[PDB]
């Protein structure tokens with residue numbers, strides 16, 4: 012389960028990113044085409060500005076969460092490399108390390 | 110606008126909490142290693158304990 | 159390189175922070191002076207917010 | 208920057224531009240009843256306003272330019288300039304006559320006797336409000352006392368509510384017992400419209416067109432001319448005023464009779480019922496697949512290989528086939544020569560494939576040696 | 579005419595806003611209109627406009 | 628021509644549980660294989676709904692009931708006894724009122740200043756010479772003036788024979804008066820059940836959207852009387868009621884998690900804020 016958690020977390024993060032495209036973020040609609048079809052170029056820019064800001068914020072949140080998860084995985088991989096060096100390539104005197 | 114701002118505030122709080130959780134997890138991993146290697150045994154590592 | 163990267167990233171980060179001042183964020187301009195000179199205090203407050 | 212260091216860089220996904228545009232509107236030829244709605248010899252009183260259904264027609268609205276001239280024309284929820292490009296689902300014209308000073312009250316979120324007791328508009332109101340002076344039609348010498356308005360009511364009306372009752376309004380505390388008198392007024396009062404009258408206290412004819420956009424089947428359309436339907440090609444489409452870009456393909460979905468568009472988890476339109484032929488078409492974006500650029504230093508050379516992930520090279524979705532097309536396990540690599548040898552990784556393509564710049568001089572791709 | 583003064587503005591439709599005079603709404607500038615009766619109107623009709 | 632009906636036997640109002648019933652399509656957009664969360668005027672799950680009978684064995688109930696933000700009206704029938712509704716505030720010609728009626732030939736919808744009678748009903752007469760049934764009485768309203776909205780459907784002829792056995796048709800309706808629009812969602816299912824509302828889930832589809840523009844606070848069902856030689860006396864007592872039943876519940880603003888299957892049908896739903904487990908399900912989507 013410890014690896015299935017990694018796989019599920021990545022898949023769920025991407026699925027959440029896809030799901031978050033349905034938010035208005037204050038705009039009249041969450042769909043670019045609806046805004047561009049009912050509004051002229053004039054205020055369609057204002058609405059698309061709100062949409063762009065919201066979706067960029069969604070991407071930034073996703074990337075920050077991924078950075079934290081990658082830091083966790085880096086710690087785990089450093090531990091794995093240490094165990095490889097000290098228990099596969101040697102015999103560890105450390106208690107309960109292996 | 111209020112909802113957007115307050116949701117951003119909550120997201121900032123949660124991100125800071127994740128960072129501090131990572132720090133505390135590092136500290137707790139160190140503490141568990143020390144419990145295993147110094148309480149449950151004798152450590153030859155210099156200045157570890 | 160591991161040390162040089164640690165320098166470069168920080169500098170790069172700081173440089174990015176300057177460049178991101180050139181964004182409207184929905185305002186009519188990315189410059190406070192332009193907004194305050196074209197718009198009075200009335201709606202320049204909204205834009206500056 | 209003008210210099211690119213050695214490595215592999217992710218570029219934008221593969222893009223396909225639309226080859227042609229298509230417009231698909233419902234097949235209808237009748238003109239909308241502009242004559243009956245605007246050129247009406249008899250408008251209704253504001254307290255009892257006339258609602259008329261408009262359906263199965265074309266909203267050209269350039270026939271009004273010859274004769275009509277509207278004092279106010281304010282559209283909410285839609286730009287005036289897009290009205291020629293849209294289709295409207297269920298269209299109602301609410302017609303009445305009011306005072307010239309009260310035309311400002313026909314708008315969302317207003318107060319006053321007309322906005323409160325006679326005719327109320329919502330704020331989720333997609334529509335248009337049209338008002339024009341009719342002093343030469345609705346006013347006559349000595350006063351036209353045929354147009355009435357409700358002056359007293361116990362509570363404000365709900366949006367799009369009508370109240371044609373004529374019960375005596377009990378302003379005071381004593382019961383009225385259905386007879387006028389002290390603190391017992393007849394709720395309705397008649398406008399006095401005359402030709403020698405101030406512009407603010409002159410008759411104005413008001414038509415409120417209420418409709419919806421891009422959510423249900425539409426029988427009222429703009430004057431846009433339809434076009435043949437082309438499938439399996441990235442195209443710009445305009446389906447009942449819903450614009451977009453993508454590939455249209457046959458669909459197995461079975462829409463209910465009351466449905467026109469299908470939507471996915473992201474609320475984008477995934478399917479659409481073709482208005483001309485009652486068939487369902489799936490809409491799919493034509494941009495898809497990742498593209499990476501493998502380059503040595505730009506000083507070293509301007510040659511670059513392109514790794515098109517998720518395309519099979521064994522008509523392709525590539526920018527230029529060129530030569531040296533090799534199907535790696537990480538995608539299709541174009542511009543790099545495959546070599547049977549193996550060396551240490553220099554530019555990791557992925558999936559155990561690496562690339563380098565070697566000797567005349569060209570980019571080679573190989574399977575990395577572990578040791 | 580008076581009824582068409584509303585059409586001299588960004589994002590408008592009608593005779594004037596489609597066939598005679600069109601504005602953007604990236605339109606920095608401004609519109610001034612004043613009633614010209616008893617200056618451009620004469621008995622029997624002024625058909626020069 | 629209206630006549631009050633006196634040969635009644637008063638009983639307490641019966642009550643029933645609505646087992647995940649009264650869900651309708653919130654909008655006209657096709658959705659398939661998704662868990663869509665929507666907030667609207669829904670009938671709460673496992674809510675208590677009033678129960679009205681029409682039987683002889685004589686008990687029949689057509690009281691004037693409130694109309695609180697919308698109504699869910701289910702009817703279990705086998706002989707077409709319940710054939711319309713009246714909506715309004717005073718129902719006395721001082722205000723406008725809505726009449727929906729299926730008079731065995733057409734479906735008539737009318738927003739009109741009706742002077743409704745205390746006991747409005749339709750009446751089908753049994754014929755002994757020829758075993759044929761046809762509507763003979765229409766005692767809904769005595770007057771109609773200033774008669775704004777009118778719609779009449781195409782002619783038809785439905786089987787109004789009084790059947791003996793088990794209820795066959797379940798007809799579910801959702802009425803709501805929003806922004807001057809009377810929205811009716813409808814569903815019809817075949818069943819074989821004696822007394823209560825059937826279990827299961829069935830999603831009501833948009834039937835019609837009438838621009839009545841009327842204030843509505845009360846409504847009353849219009850039942851059809853069987854008249855035959857077996858029942859003597861005047862019109863106020865010479866009648867009998869065919870076996871039928873209906874159930875009335877009230878919509879409230881609720882958030883639901885609807886499940887659209889691969890074919891675009893709402894197969895099931897979860898009523899958020901019913902109990903904490905439902906809240907958990909809605910949160911997890």
Ligand SMILES: C=CC1=C(C)/C(=C/c2[nH]c(/C=C3N=C(/C=C4\NC(=O)C(C)=C4C=C)C(C)=C\3CCC(=O)O)c(CCC(=O)O)c2C)NC1=O
Pocket residue numbers: 707708709710711712727728729734785786798813834
């Ligand atoms: C009261 C207004 C009323 C409504 C809203 C209504 C809806 C309605 N009922 C229908 C079927 C039908 N409707 C009825 C009769 C009724 N069904 C009911 O909900 C009620 C109350 C009756 C009257 C007692 C019958 C018998 C059928 C056909 C059932 C069948 O043969 O399968 C249809 C389909 C008609 C078609 O095929 O074109 C509609 C739209 N019918 C009405 O009369």
Ligand SMILES: *[C@@H]1O[C@H](CO)[C@@H](O[C@@H]2O[C@H](CO)[C@@H](O)[C@H](O)[C@H]2NC(C)=O)[C@H](O)[C@H]1NC(C)=O
Pocket residue numbers: 361362363364365716842843844
């Ligand atoms: C719609 O009808 C109801 C009932 O007639 C109105 O509610 C009444 O309003 C009066 C005065 O406002 C009160 O004295 C009554 O107590 C109310 N009765 C009930 C049951 O609510 C309501 O005002 C009407 N709504 C509109 C917009 O006219």
Ligand SMILES: *[C@@H]1O[C@H](CO)[C@@H](O[C@@H]2O[C@H](CO)[C@@H](O)[C@H](O)[C@H]2NC(C)=O)[C@H](O)[C@H]1NC(C)=O
Pocket residue numbers: 730731732733735762765779
């Ligand atoms: C059911 O209602 C409809 C409409 O009220 C009736 O149809 C009308 O009947 C009268 C007879 O006097 C005609 O004058 C009208 O022209 C009819 N209008 C229509 C068909 O739209 C119908 O007769 C009623 N049927 C029963 C059995 O009562």
Ligand SMILES: CCCCC/C=C\C/C=C/CCCCCCCC(=O)O
Pocket residue numbers: 318319320
């Ligand atoms: C006697 C001085 C007035 C003091 C009022 C103080 C607070 C209320 C502000 C009320 C708005 C002005 C009311 C006039 C508009 C009502 C008529 C209409 O719009 O149709």
Ligand SMILES: CCCCC/C=C\C/C=C/CCCCCCCC(=O)O
Pocket residue numbers: 239240241244261266268271277280290295298300335337416418427591592593
């Ligand atoms: C018969 C009513 C049909 C209404 C058509 C339905 C929806 C579209 C509304 C379109 C424009 C309505 C008329 C515009 C009048 C202003 C013309 C002008 O600016 O000079």
Ligand SMILES: *[C@@H]1O[C@H](CO)[C@@H](O)[C@H](O)[C@H]1NC(C)=O
Pocket residue numbers: 234483484485
């Ligand atoms: C006219 O409308 C009908 C609606 O089904 C459609 O079948 C037909 O193709 C349309 N005419 C043309 C030339 O497309």
Ligand SMILES: *[C@@H]1O[C@H](CO)[C@@H](O)[C@H](O)[C@H]1NC(C)=O
Pocket residue numbers: 241242246270271274
């Ligand atoms: C409206 O009425 C005037 C005069 O009756 C007429 O000149 C004009 O053609 C009419 N316009 C339309 C669209 O019917």
Ligand SMILES: *[C@@H]1O[C@H](CO)[C@@H](O)[C@H](O)[C@H]1NC(C)=O
Pocket residue numbers: 210504506507
């Ligand atoms: C490219 O290589 C040359 C050496 O021939 C060097 O002078 C140059 O600095 C290199 N380009 C960059 C951007 O460093």
Ligand SMILES: *[C@@H]1O[C@H](CO)[C@@H](O)[C@H](O)[C@H]1NC(C)=O
Pocket residue numbers: 519521536
């Ligand atoms: C598609 O790519 C895979 C390798 O990723 C390959 O095995 C397969 O043969 C390709 N399809 C065809 C028809 O060759």
Ligand SMILES: *[C@@H]1O[C@H](CO)[C@@H](O)[C@H](O)[C@H]1NC(C)=O
Pocket residue numbers: 545546547
């Ligand atoms: C690589 O090896 C294969 C045999 O496995 C051979 O068919 C092919 O010609 C060789 N290609 C090169 C460039 O040496």
Ligand SMILES: *[C@@H]1O[C@H](CO)[C@@H](O)[C@H](O)[C@H]1NC(C)=O
Pocket residue numbers: 629630631745
């Ligand atoms: C009985 O019928 C008459 C008219 O026929 C009606 O006026 C009266 O209200 C009815 N009785 C009651 C208690 O309503």
Ligand SMILES: *[C@@H]1O[C@H](CO)[C@@H](O)[C@H](O)[C@H]1NC(C)=O
Pocket residue numbers: 642675676
């Ligand atoms: C309706 O059902 C609930 C629970 O069964 C009960 O508490 C309530 O009393 C019932 N309503 C009435 C009026 O009894």
Ligand SMILES: *[C@@H]1O[C@H](CO)[C@@H](O)[C@H](O)[C@H]1NC(C)=O
Pocket residue numbers: 754756757759
């Ligand atoms: C048949 O039914 C009709 C319905 O009223 C009735 O008038 C007629 O009398 C019946 N036929 C005979 C022969 O009685």
Ligand SMILES: *[C@@H]1O[C@H](CO)[C@@H](O)[C@H](O)[C@H]1NC(C)=O
Pocket residue numbers: 255371772773774
């Ligand atoms: C309502 O009815 C009365 C009499 O039938 C009539 O005097 C009045 O004009 C009518 N009002 C409306 C709006 O129809």
Ligand SMILES: *[C@@H]1O[C@H](CO)[C@@H](O)[C@H](O)[C@H]1NC(C)=O
Pocket residue numbers: 888890
């Ligand atoms: C969905 O529609 C298809 C018809 O192609 C049918 O075979 C299938 O049974 C349906 N499945 C459900 C769950 O309705």
